[PDB]
């Protein structure tokens, strides 16, 4: 979905400062040519869209859309692609219409789409185009949402956005309840190795599958093991076929990052409960079991790259070497004989990755430093250490070190001798603060990872895994998650509708080979040819018992949840079921930040900004108005003088805090003197 994406801001396109809100709006020529659900949710609403599932581009650049033409009530199969003007020429009906598989709309008054966007019950003769399918209006990432036709469009928007932000876990189990658009969207995404020509597997490994084509030739599909993606995630590809199987032309042969037996899998299936548990799941917060941490259910691998170069200078050239001035030896145990750490060393924040020193020159020394060097006999040590240290809050193993050298005849930039990259990887388990979301925009951070004992368990003794909130469901208008939860419990425990006294009433519209199903069988409700709440109601009455004669979940969908904490049963049965939830890419370790004293800016003497440097938080204008509205004058004086710009005052504050003295009086900030010099330079005498 980062390809096939329509963008509306560029050279000659509309900028945001000139953006008119009319262009933000959808209007009924997007049906089939764009997706009204999926768009960015910030200030770029409606500008950036996405292509539909079935859309196509004309040779002039107009966006086609396939329709089945119907000739006099006979819905043909001449699937004619149509552009927008030609769609306005004719009238277009809908695919969810009663058809006897002979053309022949059963209802004469059919839903239809006029040119200007009108919806009329035209008699069933003037209809000349039908839709190819339902869900033609929708994008790819939204077509993977189950029960889409029950959600509000805001929360379906948030589900379609946050389905593009899952991280690939280490197990990556396929979802129980899904749509049809997972397998096709994975085999078209290119991150699954697909067997080109049919044949028999000669040999598997973790690194290669050598296939054997039916006519003599073999071919090895090399894997891609632990590649770092562009945002620092896993990219493993384990093979799924065995040493003697047969593959066909188009068979999935290797599950990529977020796949499982070929189809897409962004999260795991989890037992859910919808009760408000003890205030920890308050205002979209989610609590979890400890089973997820213990069994590595939610565990992403994050691979970060570090690199340093060795370029020349006026004083010579920088020197990657094990010998570092003024350094100890316990930090120089990770390093090998020529700089870089060994593959497999676990480093912490602030450890040496590449021992690299520069020529410094010759400066005069302070007399205290001079006599200490005279006392301890140490020399001047004319080189200055600026080594590559793994920065704060990063740790984990060292996967691989790729070093490029000017002496090895590589393509380095001018005047750079040795370029060396280091890939540090960690295994980020789940934690509180990590953002989680289902497939319906029901997002939220992790409130508290409970131990597995004091978590509400069913009568079976199965503890639930996460506990959602009730008050997030109705007022956000997505009970698609509740229908997905009920259908998840049905597909998890399996069912067998008893067609002994005939097939029952709701099951007649239901297709065959779904009246009975094994436990943990995957099903698929597509987007608008959905599950039909009456049929789901009939399903939940007829599920099969777990291991004993024991029906945990009644016909309404609620189980008698015991309490793990105190131990008495909860006095009302509680909706439980199986739910699909993804680990989002807004984890805490990327987000946490703190700085007591770090770098400073160049022109004005303010602290810097962002987690890449240290930086401090922007104490902007609205914070200043709040501090004035309290009347707190002193704190505002501190925040605007002796924590940012009173340049003598910063070291005076540090010295007085460490020595234990009073915080001294602030002075004039440096940014005011900069403004004063600017106004003086503009020929304004500012005394």
């Amino acid at each position: 979905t980062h390809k096939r994406r329509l963008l509306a801001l560029g050279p000659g396109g509309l900028s945001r400062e000139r953006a008119g809100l009319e262009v933000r709006d959808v209007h009924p020529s997007h049906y089939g040519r764009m997706c009204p659900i999926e768009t960015p949710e910030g200030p770029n609403i409606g500008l950036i869209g996405s292509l539909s599932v079935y859309a196509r581009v004309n040779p002039f650049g107009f966006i086609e859309t396939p329709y089945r033409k119907v000739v006099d009530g006979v819905v043909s199969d001449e699937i004619v692609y149509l552009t927008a003007d030609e769609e306005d020429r004719h009238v277009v009906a809908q695919a969810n219409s009663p058809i006897d598989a002979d053309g022949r709309f059963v209802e004469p008054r059919v839903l239809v789409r006029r040119k200007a966007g009108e919806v009329e019950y035209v008699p069933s003769s003037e209809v000349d185009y039908m839709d190819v399918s339902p869900r033609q209006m929708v994008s790819v990432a939204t077509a993977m949402i189950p029960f889409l036709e029950h959600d509000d469009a805001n929360r379906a928007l948030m589900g379609a956005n946050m389905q593009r932000q899952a991280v690939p876990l280490v197990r990556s189990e396929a979802p129980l309840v899904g749509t049809g658009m997972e397998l096709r969207a994975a085999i078209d995404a290119g991150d699954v190795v697909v067997a080109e020509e049919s044949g028999v597997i000669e040999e598997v490994s973790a690194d290669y599958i050598t296939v054997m084509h039916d006519n003599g030739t073999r071919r090895t599909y090399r894997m891609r093991k632990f590649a770092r993606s562009n945002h620092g995630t896993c990219a493993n590809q384990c093979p799924i076929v065995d040493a003697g199987d047969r593959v066909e032309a188009g068979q999935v042969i290797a599950d990529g990052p977020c796949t499982d037996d070929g189809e897409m899998a962004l999260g795991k299936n989890l037992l859910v409960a919808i009760m408000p548990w003890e205030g920890h799941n308050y205002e979209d917060a989610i609590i979890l079991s400890n089973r997820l941490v213990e069994e590595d259910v939610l565990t992403s691998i994050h691979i970060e790259e570090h690199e340093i170069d060795a370029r020349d200078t006026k004083l010579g050239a920088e020197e990657i070497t094990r010998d570092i001035p003024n350094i100890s030896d316990e930090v120089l145990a990770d390093l090998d004989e020529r700089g870089i750490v060994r593959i497999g060393a676990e480093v912490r924040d602030g450890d040496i990755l590449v021992g690299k020193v520069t020529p410094k020159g010759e400066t005069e020394l302070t007399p205290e430093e001079r006599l200490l060097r005279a006392i301890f006999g140490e020399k001047a040590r004319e080189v200055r250490d600026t080594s590559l240290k793994v920065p704060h809050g990063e740790s984990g193993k060292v996967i691989g070190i790729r070093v490029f050298s000017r002496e090895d005849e590589d393509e380095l930039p001018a005047g750079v001798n040795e370029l060396v990259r280091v890939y540090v990887a960690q295994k980020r388990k789940i934690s509180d603060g990590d953002k989680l979301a289902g497939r319906h925009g029901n997002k939220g951070v992790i409130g508290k990872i409970l131990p597995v004992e004091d978590m509400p368990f069913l009568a079976d003794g199965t503890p639930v895994d996460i506990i959602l909130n009730t008050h997030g469901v109705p007022r956000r208008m997505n009970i698609g998650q509740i229908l997905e939860t009920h259908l998840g419990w049905c597909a998890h425990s399996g069912w067998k509708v008893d067609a002994a006294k005939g097939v029952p009433d709701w099951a007649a519209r239901l297709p065959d080979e779904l009246l009975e199903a094994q436990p943990n069988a995957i099903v698929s409700t597509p987007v608008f040819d959905g599950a039909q709440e009456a049929e789901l109601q009939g399903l939940l009455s007829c599920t099969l018992p777990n291991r004993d004669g024991d029906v945990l979940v009644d016909a309404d969908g609620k189980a008698m949840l015991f309490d793990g904490r105190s131990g008495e049963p909860f006095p009302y049965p509680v909706t439980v079921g199986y739910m699909y939830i993804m680990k989002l890419h807004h984890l805490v370790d990327d987000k946490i930040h703190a700085r007591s004293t770090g770098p400073y800016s160049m022109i004005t003497q303010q602290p810097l900004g962002g987690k890449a440097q240290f930086g401090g938080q922007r104490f902007g204008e609205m914070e200043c108005w709040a501090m004035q509205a309290y009347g707190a004058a002193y704190t505002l004086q501190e925040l605007l003088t002796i924590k940012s710009d009173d340049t003598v005052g910063r070291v005076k504050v540090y010295e007085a805090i460490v020595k234990g003295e009073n915080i001294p009086e602030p002075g004039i900030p440096e940014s005011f003197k900069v403004l004063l010099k600017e106004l003086q330079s503009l020929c304004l005498n500012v005394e």
Binding site: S133, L183, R184, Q251, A517, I522, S524, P526
Partner: peptide, 27 residues
Amino acid sequence: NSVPGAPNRVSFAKLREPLEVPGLLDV
């Protein structure tokens, strides 16, 4: 099925659409 190594995901679909989903990177 339309893909030779697909897991059998039993569908609740009542319709039958003729046009299969195109080669999504065609654009």
